[PDB]
Amino acid sequence: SEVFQECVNLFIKRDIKDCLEKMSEVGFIDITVFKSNPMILDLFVSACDIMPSFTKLGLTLQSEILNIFTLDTPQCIETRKIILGDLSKLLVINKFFRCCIKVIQFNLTDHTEQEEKTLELESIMSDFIFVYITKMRTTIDVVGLQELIEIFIFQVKVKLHHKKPSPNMYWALCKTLPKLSPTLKGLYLSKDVSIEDAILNSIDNKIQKDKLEVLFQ
């Protein structure tokens, strides 16, 4: 449609707030529309992933975004089934999780409620990780899987809990998901660099960044 093309054109120009406001104005931010038009959902998730947060937007747009990424709404449950159901598009699954994180991080004010939703997200994500490495064994998106685990560690365990990075976060996840380390050690981003190797290296770099970057400013 012409109106959908207008939204796409705003996205191409990185007028992301205007893109989302137009989607809201025309009624596209709606699970019923998402189910009937996969590319409308794809645009919505991609645009929301670029927004620093959802807090500076108009009230109507904000309420419609929150309905899609608040974990216990009917619309979020349905959207999650659609996005997590396409195991071939792991990078979009990762965008969706980042959008859920953005709601907890910036739209929630009560730390007790933030913790409550963070724990819910942890279960959703760890359950999905098991599904992915089981159902897509032999057909793993190595780069997407590295990104997924690093969202869990750096955005959820570190950022949402306000907790310093540690290799123990990786080993703890592997003890709850015993299939994980074998999978990640056997898949390679490059010669002699497994996903596990890369994640542990990322954790080490993040530790040094956390310790030193502000000192150097």
Any descriptors?
globular, two-stranded antiparallel sheet, 217 residues, Peroxisomal membrane protein PEX15, transmembrane, mainly alpha, 12 helices, peroxisome biogenesis, 2% strand, transmembrane helix
Describe the structure.
There is one protein chain. The protein is mostly helical and 217 residues long. It has one domain. The chain contains twelve helices and two strands. Strands 1-2 form a two-stranded antiparallel sheet. A hairpin with a 2-residue loop joins strand 1 and strand 2 (193-194). Helix 7 (90-107) runs antiparallel to helix 8 and helix 7 runs parallel beside helix 9. Residues 1-211 are cytoplasmic.
Treating each run of at least 4 consecutive H or I residues as one helix, how many helices?
A: 12
Query: Strand content of the residues, in percent?
Result: under 5%
Q: Using DSSP, what is the number of strands?
A: 2
Helix content: over 70%
Lateral arrangement of strands in the main beta sheet: 1-2
| N-end to C-end Cα span | 49 Å
Q: What is the domain tally?
A: 1
Q: What structural class do you assign from the helix and strand content? A: mainly alpha
Could you describe the largest sheet, including whether it forms a barrel?
2 strands, antiparallel
Bulk shape: globular
Order of helices and strands: HHHHHHHHHHHEEH
- From the alpha carbons, calculate the radius of gyration and give it in angstroms: 18 Å
